[PDB]
Amino acid sequence: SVALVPHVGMGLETRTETWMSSEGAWKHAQRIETWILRHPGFTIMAAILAYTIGTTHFQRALIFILLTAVAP
């Protein structure tokens, strides 16, 4: 809805703090981790898929964090 595209990375910011600093700065980092602790199956299976395709450890960690991030 309109509650997505939240007007973040488009400049215009100054010393004065925004409408939501310290509230809308960690809300995408809490609900991912809440989704991990409430849906572990895609975390283990995403770890197996990331560990499968990927030669170095950096690519396995990268695809793991990205597949963990794209899911809600």
Binding site: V2, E13, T14, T16, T18, W19, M20, E23, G24
Partner: peptide
């Protein structure tokens, strides 16, 4: 009412006031 969704849509928008005048309090 899409008001609270819009209040979470303005995360990163510097508030000004225009209830009397149009006074901005940001910038350089």
């Amino acid at each position: 009412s899409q008001e609270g969704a819009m209040h979470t849509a303005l995360t990163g928008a510097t508030e000004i006031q225009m209830s009397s005048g149009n006074l901005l309090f940001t910038g350089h």
